[PDB]
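Our collaborator T.R. sent over the components below with a one-line note: 'Predict the complex.' Nothing else. No constraints on interfaces, no templates requested, no preferences about which chain binds where. So this is a plain run: every listed entity goes in together, and whatever single assembly comes back becomes the starting point for the next discussion.
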Amino acid sequence: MKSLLRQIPQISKVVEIFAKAYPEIYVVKAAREVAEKYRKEIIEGARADLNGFLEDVERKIKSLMKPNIKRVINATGVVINTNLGRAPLSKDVINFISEIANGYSNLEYNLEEGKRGSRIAHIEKYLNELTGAESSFVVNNNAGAVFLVLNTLAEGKEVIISRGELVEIGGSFRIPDIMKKSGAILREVGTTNKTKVSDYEGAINQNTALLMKVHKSNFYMEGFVEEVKLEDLVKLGHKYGIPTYYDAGSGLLINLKEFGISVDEPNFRDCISLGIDLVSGSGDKLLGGPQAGIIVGKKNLIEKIKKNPIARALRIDKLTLSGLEMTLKLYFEKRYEDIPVIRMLTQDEKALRQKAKRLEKLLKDIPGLKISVIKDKAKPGGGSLPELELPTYCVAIRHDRLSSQELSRRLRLAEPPIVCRIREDQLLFDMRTVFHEDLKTIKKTLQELLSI
RNA sequence: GGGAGUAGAUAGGCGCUGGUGUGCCUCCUAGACUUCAAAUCUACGGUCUCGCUAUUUAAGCGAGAGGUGGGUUCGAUUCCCACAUACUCCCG
RNA sequence: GGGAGUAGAUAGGCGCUGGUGUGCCUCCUAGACUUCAAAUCUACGGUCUCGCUAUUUAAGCGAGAGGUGGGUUCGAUUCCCACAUACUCCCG
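Returned assembly:
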């Protein structure tokens, strides 16, 4: 027992084995981790050999020297992929962020008056113009955007909402569970599938401080189903003197039909010009910018929200703020194609095949590869457009040696890693989400796994 | 004087390491080598000590200590704790 | 790959039954009968593995396997459960 462990060398001795091989710091860390795995494996009597030690210690070093979060090549064809980090950023934005983070900036400083200033002041100019709302505000994310409006205007008082709009988006967010913690009392009207206007108007009373509607972003209902029109709820509010609050969620900044895609998804400008008092949404969904809770509406309300002592715990960071301004700057200049998420969904059907076969031309040489391009209909929107179904070209592949399952697995372990769909033992690569500079990296990773 | 930080050798200065210590530089001594010097290289080397044989001394041989003590642990130079000391910083 | 639906013999295909399994069809065979055929009819029949008796062989017989195990029960081929395996459909 006590000889199968004395064996394990000394950390000073393996540090030497890797003089300039690897940084001394990373070597000792790998030696300790490895030194402990052999002390316990020999104590339980499951190891008789120690030759695996030297080879392993170097593997920990090779592993411990790489950050965990890593860029990932998305081949699934889902633009708003909740799991892969939603809306990706254009180089233009990322450099504007790079520069403001490089050194000091006038984040909370107004250069004119030479005294402290509100950091939320830089942006709001853009929002008010783009939406048409009276005033605006921005916080960490939309989850908090909701929580803030409720605790600001309905703490202790009733909020009416349709029983079909109490959603569970994400793993931890649930309108009913957060609104609870929001301090607002929840008044659910109508039924799951159907909800008329009479349901809303019927539950109003002395405590009703808010009429709230949530947009079913991550799901939808078909069959016998009724919903309350937006113009109707504005009318109902202005009748009793109650505010209207729409949680768009998708955070669509513009009309979407303007780009060829025909859908009813709501957007700020239009929802604002409808008579709604407040509107919110995430910046990293249909806006295509960094994570951000966006609120626009009546000035008297925005000012009530801002003054809330909880807004300081949600106030946005220096990175997303800047990055959001450049994203908004692009919107004013109509540079639509510059923002990843808008370009990916409004891409020419022709455009997609053009990239579908430019990849197939790069994989015909690789050994054992069965390459075919198929025209499939998928659902692009992951966290904002549930029903949408648009055509896109998938380059379906298949190797004689390895199986589709094992294939996805190694591809997610590659550097860079690639995540893709699987359908009937045929790995699939949706080109709707693939950047050009990835095509070269796709071919170089597949040739390293099948010819190695 | 009161706190706190940095700390520690078993030739000497610095740095490291849960594997019974070790690497860099220096000193010393020794060896190798070198026309001379230098350079270079090497050392289960060195301190203290104690104990053993002889015992005037010489001479040969064996063992332990890491400021001190304790603890964890298969194993502590490494880690914890307590006290001491050195250097430094703040206060009366 | 994950779910789910269909499932299973003790000659072989289909159907049934809490009564120690059974009906239709086939196979194999066998027997009966008819001037001849043809037809028809009939069968406490049948596998495996092991074991047993006789033991040259025959020949006869016993056990269990109804995928495997378990349970309920007076009795399980039936019912349930678990695992595994075969056919099909939904999802990643």
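Summary for T.R.: Residues 24-43 of chain A form the longest helix (20 residues).
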